[PDB]
Design a protein around this ligand. Sequence first.
Ligand SMILES: CC(C)(C)c1nc2c3ccc(F)cc3c3c(=O)[nH]ccc3c2[nH]1
Length: 287
Amino acid sequence: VDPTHFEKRFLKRIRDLGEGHFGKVELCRYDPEGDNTGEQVAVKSLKPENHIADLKKEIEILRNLYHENIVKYKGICTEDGGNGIKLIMEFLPSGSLKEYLPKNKNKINLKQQLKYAVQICKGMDYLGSRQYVHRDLAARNVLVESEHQVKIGDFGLTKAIETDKEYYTVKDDRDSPVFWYAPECLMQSKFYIASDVWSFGVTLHELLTYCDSDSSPMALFLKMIGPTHGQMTVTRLVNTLKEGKRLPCPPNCPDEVYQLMRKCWEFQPSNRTSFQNLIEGFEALLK
Ligand SMILES: CC(C)(C)c1nc2c3ccc(F)cc3c3c(=O)[nH]ccc3c2[nH]1
């Protein structure tokens, strides 16, 4: 036995938590002593037949990340007689913003929403400093530890930008969240830190609408471009963005917050605000 990894036989399965790109997430108690004093952990495994190499890249990323607003890497579980691996993380009981916010409209106010925005921007600024682009920043990937704390909670599409380079070129865009993507990503498959800033703008929009499904980026953008274009969808998205159309101001979102959102949605990546600038922008609105 390796005591530095998690033993499969002791990751006692409790509950399904959610499904990712290359893995599913389940709640387990790691209880190697057998006395139920072990902690609950979240465990990301490969789905029944997307690949092991992909999950291994996510493990490599998450080992390399340590931030208050990034889901905490705990370890790995290696599988016998096979290339199998599992990713072990801390358990964040309230799940994603996407499920949490609709249940807590009356509890979470604008000020708390702005604090989440700051926490997300801090996670992301850290992420960028490590030279990663997230490529999947949406409220469904922001996990809630508690009313007062959120963490970026999945890294399945995350890529490293080479030192001295400004973007990573994606060769495999097969499940990109196109309604969260900046024009350069849609048009050229180039992903800059400024591309994550764009996606944050969209994540912010979700937050302010409490992740109401009827006001989701997809639901709103499909209203602008028509729903039945299939393979022409991204073309129509690009057309609309070139025209300078953006998601509208959530109702009850103040203009000064909306103006920060808009700074994330400049067409040219270089014209967009930084995450550090967002952090300071939001903090100036917090008393
Ligand atoms: C679907 C996705 C891969 C983003 C994911 N969903 C969850 C999740 C959902 C509900 C919940 F109570 C906890 C989690 C959770 C968690 O607690 N830790 C790490 C990831 C993760 C997660 N990761």
